[PDB]
């Protein structure tokens, strides 16, 4: 996270680690949603143009962590994935559209003080939570700015939902109603963004009502962390919540 601030103990019990096994690497962040249903970004598993096509056997989930760098002697749950299913209308060649993905972890994991599942949106909280002005916070382990910085611990920035009339005439890319943007206007002395390495990574929000945390989005893309007047685009975990519970219905636990 850029212009962020090193997260606290379990600020995100649900923050995952996309981890490449050859060589040892971190692709991105991901959210626990089941005892084995984790949701990331597709691109984090399939970007043909840059020859990104990462497979089940391949990747390691790294659940309940803090140090980006080290293996918590006994915090971390290093886990296998049985299956990865991206979403079928996920447009790579055009604009990271419908860039989502479920991976059915190989077995259940316990929810031990730093490993914990997050609320999957509903019309209610969503409807009324998802108003531009309101703020949510990405959470990841990645570039701190756009260059070759990779942090100590999980970072977190706090940002406000941005309306369409800006995230349109913001970028040449075409913007689908299957993302929103989270930034600050420039005559708004503050700042932050997600960045290369963040993706798959929750944009979660606090419902003043049932006081739970829900995934209003995921880090999708952007035209370079903090371009002042450029926004970060995350995906509408709602307007697709349908694609999600179908896969679970169909498979696993």
């Amino acid at each position: 996270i850029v212009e962020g601030s090193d997260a606290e103990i379990g600020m995100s019990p649900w923050q995952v680690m996309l981890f490449r096994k050859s060589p040892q690497e971190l692709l991105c962040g991901a959210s626990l949603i089941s005892d084995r249903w984790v949701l990331t970004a597709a691109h984090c598993l399939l970007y043909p143009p840059w020859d990104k096509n990462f497979t089940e056997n391949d990747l390691l989930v790294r659940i309940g962590k803090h140090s980006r760098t080290r293996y918590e002697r006994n915090i971390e749950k290093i886990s296998m994935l049985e299956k990865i299913y991206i979403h079928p209308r996920y447009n790579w060649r055009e604009n990271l559209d419908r860039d989502i993905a479920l991976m059915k972890l190989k077995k259940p994991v316990a929810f031990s003080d730093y490993i914990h599942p997050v609320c999957l949106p509903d019309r209610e909280t969503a409807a009324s939570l998802l108003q531009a002005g309101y703020k949510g916070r990405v959470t990841g382990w990645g570039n701190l700015k756009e260059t070759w910085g990779q942090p100590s611990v999980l970072q977190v920035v706090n940002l406000p939902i941005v309306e369409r009339p800006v995230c349109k005439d913001s970028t040449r890319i075409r913007i689908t109603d299957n993302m929103f943007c989270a930034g600050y206007k420039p005559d708004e002395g503050k700042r932050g963004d997600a960045c290369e390495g963040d993706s798959g990574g929750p944009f979660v929000m606090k419902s003043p009502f049932n006081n739970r945390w829900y995934q209003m989005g995921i880090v999708s893309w952007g035209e370079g962390c903090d371009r002042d007047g450029k926004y970060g685009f995350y995906t509408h975990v709602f307007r697709l919540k349908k694609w999600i519970q179908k896969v679970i219905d169909q498979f696993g636990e």
Partner: protein
């Protein structure tokens, strides 16, 4: 799973399940001109 659909989705052991509030919760919970 689905929505709020674990059993106690989105409710934090070190924090909400333990009525501890984070560094900058109140930064959000203030976004919604005044949620709580």
């Amino acid at each position: 799973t689905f929505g709020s659909g674990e059993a106690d989705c989105g409710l934090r052991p070190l924090f909400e399940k333990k009525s501890l509030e984070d560094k900058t919760e109140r930064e959000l919970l203030e976004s919604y001109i005044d949620g709580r």
